[PDB]
Design a protein around this nucleic acid. Structure first.
Ligand SMILES: [Mg+2]
Ligand SMILES: [Mg+2]
Ligand SMILES: [Mg+2]
Ligand SMILES: [Mg+2]
Ligand SMILES: [Mg+2]
Lengths: 192, 132, 76, 202, 109
RNA sequence: GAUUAACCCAAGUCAAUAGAAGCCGGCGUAAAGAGUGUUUUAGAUCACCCCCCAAUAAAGCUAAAACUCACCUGAGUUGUAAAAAACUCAGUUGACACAAAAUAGACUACGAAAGUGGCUUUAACAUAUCUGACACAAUAGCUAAGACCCAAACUGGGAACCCCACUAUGCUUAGCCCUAAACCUCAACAGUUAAUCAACAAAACUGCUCGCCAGAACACUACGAGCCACAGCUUAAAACUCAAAGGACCUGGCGGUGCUUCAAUCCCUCUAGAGGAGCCUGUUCUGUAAUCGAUAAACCCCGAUCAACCUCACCACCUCUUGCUCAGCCUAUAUACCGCCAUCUUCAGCAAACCUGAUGAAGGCUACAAAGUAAGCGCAAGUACCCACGUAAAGACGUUAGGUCAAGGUGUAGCCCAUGAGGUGGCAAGAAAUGGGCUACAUUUUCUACCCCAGAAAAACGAUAGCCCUUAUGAAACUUAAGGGUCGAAGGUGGAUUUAGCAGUAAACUGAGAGUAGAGUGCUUAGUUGAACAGGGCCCUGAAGCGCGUACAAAGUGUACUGAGUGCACUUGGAC
């Protein structure tokens, strides 16, 4: 249903909570009363409705197919090109992934999407990352790789990844320090 | 309680204008700047002199047009010119208005070494934005 | 009578403002302040429909006669 | 939390997604359909779909963490696992055929059995009527208490210059065999509960 | 205060005697309520009767409802018996202290 | 009290006294319906139409329950919060009153009132078809004699109130006393429902008669008198004093008021810390010739984004006099203010202007809606940052005479050869406590390389402190900061206790900026790694509802003992 403010704007009138409840309950009864098309059309005037984009598969000069995508985490940005076919090589900033990320946690982050879709060793990846710390860079590269792999994995696989969280951009970012308190929430030691 | 640049509520008989009715936090959101110059911009200089000029000009005009200004005075600094825009009551005679305008123009121009223009817009009365 | 079996506040307010009130007063109503009381039954659906039809017909006839007389006056 | 209340925690379990539709109940079908519309939080960096993922061990690592050195925490945990396995291997090699059957060699099995042995059945809370009263412990509290007790015992200064991996491995084996100061601590808690039995009506 | 303690004892005995019979009500009597104790507020503004709870949640709720409904009648019965010339309002409070002992003994077993 | 001005009257004025003002009003709660009934003389027109329940006295009687006595058994019985004290007595059964009268009674009758609730019998419940002073009068009390189960003033014992025993007394007879919240607090009789009416109470009145009241207290008192037969009741004043007393209602305040809900969020629960040692730093006391303000939350690296001179307002000394200023004053007054803020507020209410109580103080709620609408302000909404999230921002009216006259302005106060102005020199210390911060006590550490695949240290860890030297700034370095050497101290996770945090948060680490010539471990700000609990309850805090009881802007009448309680009856002018 449209919210009470929506209904108030529709009726250019000022209602109350109980008025909205009465209207909504009457509408619900109208639904339950086998509302036909002639009535469902009127009802839908008060209803309110509540997928990852598949990037094009481009081709190189040699005709090898690939998909390019991008993603940002904290302050890091990553552009990932994933090839339709590959032996699992993942070169980051022209560097091998294991060398560039000396932390097995970051390696696991890189592996997460391809492991999830069971496509490890089936794609060669080139990831250019910039900015932020090591974990932010790992997250950005993971997001970019997942998005690029979407184009190559089936739609059901894409939906599964999105449900898992691979394909959802992280909204968690550092919260700015506030004046008069040490941290974003750390209130200075309460004097007495 | 914040006492800064706010008009406290009263019995409802206190008329107030746009500026007086808007508090500082709304600045740059609902109300603009009463002085528009480039001093405070990044990498520029002479912010202190722009501020001093603004204060002096505002006091000068307030003392020159007693009970005549119906709104605050808007200062613009294009190039090196100066533009003082005022809303004035239609209570003082036009001849006096013109003489004061010319005198202030010339005197301020000679004082600060830059052309100055005064632009008056007249109203029957101070524009009430609400009553408090 | 309001839903709590009390005289509708509108009756007293109309008396205050000096707006004449026709009113279908039941045996438990209070016709003291109704300008034109019509003792009758206010609960029978047939009675209420009869009242509504009568008033609708009266208003319609009054308006049509008003229009007819206005036209008669203006034509001449 | 920057996540709005609408966001739901992600579910990471391949089997849950591979389960056939037919085996699903109507309630499970409805839940699966509903989840298609909800918002899912981005996965935490800790847990994944690896077949070698142990939430108990991850929690113990997090508890053993100091100041955010998860790297050192994980190093210590894996080192303790390796040390326990090494000791079990030595015992197995030094044991006859019959004793070899009874000898365990899986570090995770020893780890979990020792923690279970160190879980306290009951714990004493202050009740007001304040009186320290024997009160049942929830399972989460029991597990948390076991983990904290093990970590504290390993952090006791009585161990002079001994490294955390060796200390933890020795304590884990002692608990696995139902011995050691952590088992003594659990027994002391139970004895206090028994002695305060009379005060339980409070 | 010794006076308060004596008042609590007398009220506990009187309330137990009251609940021994259907005098208050047959519905209340059938519930077989057992009183853990009686405590009078320091100012004599209220009398809390702590009654032992059973395991069944629906039974506990029904017993609480009946006790709340019959508290005033019980107060009147006491003041009529003259067990106390003045009796403050009676409040029935659930008692659950023995659950700790019960579940301890269950686990310890 | 004086001064000015004014007002009234005026050859008068106005202080005292006295008088003139005087009954058709009321009686439930304010004074007032006398405890009840009946006369005469009279008065009035209301005269003409017109069974029995519980009255009362007498006589007789008893079902249940008591006491006592009998046996039979038992050794304890009784007593209460729990014990004491007391009896050796206790249980069944049986006998058995001169005491009291379950159930009916959820009835509302009888009687004039008081009273009358076991059964039977006798006697019996006035009257005109009106009102109207000798006869009664509960409980209590007295006299003489009986009864005395039980209860019980008083007494005694036990630990006024509680328990035990017991007496007047409650009972019968024969006489006295005549008082009660003797109340339906509402006089008798007749009549009416016509237009309601201080308020509450038992809807409002009319006629008619008798009794009673004329502010409170003095005063249910004194004197006299009557009854007494001497310690009391009835009748009942005066003087002196006061401008009140009194009745019915409305609202705000208060608790040391409990039950139920609650709250990085009251306590526990998770993490990290403060207090234990050193150092930086602020404050208080001492000291100093020698700094103001801030002062529980809401002071205490605070005004200060900061003191070697300056700053500086302080002290010492010296100097100037229309003084930079058509002077000035950092001197009092924040308890005059503006200006800017704090606190609740980690609130959501504040609200003008309008529209029931028969137009009183006052009130304004019910959604299947019953007199509330409310502009505007605030929350909200909107906006910045990276979302639609969160944080920022905002946060009304009032609260603490909150702070700030030393940001500046200013009312008021005072100085003007000094309370103004200028120059030179100076403490800025520590018995002792305390606030905050930094560094540690180590092995998750020390150290290097590196920025996470290593080798040493490991009783050493551990000072940014102290000492010497040098460098940067600056006129001036013991003054500040920085670099080197030196020394390696206290301490081995910490007392009273206690602070903060719900997620990119805490914690840890590293940079940058403000301000200065220089100067912080201070402040501001950017970023990195980055978790744990989140569930219980309310003693403690606070916020609510349920509400209770306090009070300012059980109670009582009569009667008697004792020394305020108790005994008996009565009333609700209390609660359920
Ligand atoms: Mg009707
Ligand atoms: Mg007569
Ligand atoms: Mg008489
Ligand atoms: Mg008598
Ligand atoms: Mg006797």
């Amino acid at each position: 249903w449209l919210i009470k403010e929506e209904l108030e704007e529709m009726l250019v009138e000022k209602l109350s909570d109980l008025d909205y409840m009465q209207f909504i309950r009457l509408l619900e009864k109208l639904l339950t009363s086998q509302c036909g098309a002639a009535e469902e059309e009127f009802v839908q005037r008060f209803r309110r409705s509540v997928k990852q984009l598949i990037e094009p598969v481009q081709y190189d000069e040699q005709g090898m197919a690939f998909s390019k995508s991008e993603g940002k985490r904290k302050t890091a940005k990553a552009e990932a090109i994933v090839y339709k076919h590959g032996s699992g090589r993942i070169k980051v900033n022209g560097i091998d992934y294991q060398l560039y990320f000396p932390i097995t946690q970051d390696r696991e982050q890189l592996m997460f999407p391809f492991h999830f879709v069971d496509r490890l060793g089936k794609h060669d990846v080139t990831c250019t990352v910039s900015g932020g710390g090591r974990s932010a860079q790992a997250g950005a590269i993971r997001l970019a790789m997942a998005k690029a792999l979407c184009s190559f994995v089936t739609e059901d696989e894409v939906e599964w990844m999105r449900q898992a969280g691979l394909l959802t951009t992280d909204p968690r970012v550092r919260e700015r320090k506030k004046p008069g308190q040490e941290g974003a929430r750390r209130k200075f030691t309460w004097k007495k | 309680k914040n006492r800064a640049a706010r008009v406290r509520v009263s019995k409802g008989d206190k008329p107030v204008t746009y500026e007086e009715a808007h508090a500082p936090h709304y600045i740059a959101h609902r109300k603009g700047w009463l002085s528009l110059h480039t001093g405070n911009l990044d990498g520029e200089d002479h912010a202190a002199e722009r501020t001093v000029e603004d204060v002096f000009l505002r006091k000068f005009m307030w003392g020159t047009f007693p009970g005549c200004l119906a709104d605050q005075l808007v200062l613009k600094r294009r190039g090196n010119q100066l533009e003082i825009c005022a809303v004035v009551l239609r209570q003082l005679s036009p001849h006096k208005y013109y003489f004061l305008v010319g005198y202030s123009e010339t005197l301020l121009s000679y004082f600060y070494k830059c052309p100055v223009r005064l632009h008056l817009q007249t109203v029957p009365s101070k524009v009430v934005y609400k009553y408090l | 009578l309001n839903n709590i079996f009390e005289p509708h506040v509108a009756v007293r307010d109309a008396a205050k403002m000096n707006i004449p009130t026709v009113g279908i007063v039941d045996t438990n109503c209070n016709p003291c302040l109704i300008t034109y009381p019509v003792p009758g039954n206010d609960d029978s659906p047939l009675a209420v429909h009869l009242y509504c039809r009568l008033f609708q017909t009266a208003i319609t006839r009054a308006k049509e006669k008003r229009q007819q007389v206005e036209a008669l006056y203006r034509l001449q | 939390s920057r996540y709005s209340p609408e966001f739901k925690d992600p579910l990471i379990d391949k089997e849950y997604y591979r389960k056939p539709v037919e085996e699903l109940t109507e309630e499970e079908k409805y839940v699966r359909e509903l989840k298609k519309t909800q918002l899912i939080k981005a996965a935490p960096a800790g847990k994944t779909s690896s077949v070698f993922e142990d939430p108990v061990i991850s929690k113990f690592t997090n508890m053993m963490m100091i100041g955010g050195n998860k790297v050192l925490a994980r190093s210590l945990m894996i080192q303790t696992l390796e040390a326990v396995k090494r000791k079990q291997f030595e015992k197995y090699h030094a044991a006859s055929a019959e004793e070899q059957a009874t000898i365990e060699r899986n570090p995770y099995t020893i780890f979990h059995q020792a923690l279970k042995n160190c879980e306290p059945m009951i714990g004493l809370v202050p009740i007001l009527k304040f009186y320290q009263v024997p009160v049942p412990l929830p399972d989460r509290r029991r597990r948390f208490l076991a983990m904290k007790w093990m970590i504290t015992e390993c952090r006791d200064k009585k161990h002079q210059r001994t490294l955390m991996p060796e200390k933890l491995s020795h304590k884990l084996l002692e608990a696995f065999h139902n011995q050691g100061p952590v088992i003594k601590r659990k027994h002391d808690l139970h004895k206090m509960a028994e002695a305060n039995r009379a005060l339980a009506h409070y | 205060h010794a006076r308060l303690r004596a008042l609590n004892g007398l009220l506990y005995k009187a309330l137990t005697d009251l609940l021994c019979t259907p005098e208050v009500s047959q519905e209340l009597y059938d519930l077989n309520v057992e009183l853990s104790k009686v405590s009078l507020t320091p100012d004599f503004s209220a009398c809390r009767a702590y009654w032992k709870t059973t395991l069944s949640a629906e039974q506990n709720a029904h017993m609480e409802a009946v006790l709340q409904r019959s508290a005033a009648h019980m107060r009147h019965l006491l003041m009529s018996q003259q067990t106390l010339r003045n009796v403050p309002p009676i409040v029935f409070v659930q008692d659950k202290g023995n659950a700790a002992l019960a579940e301890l003994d269950q686990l310890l077993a």
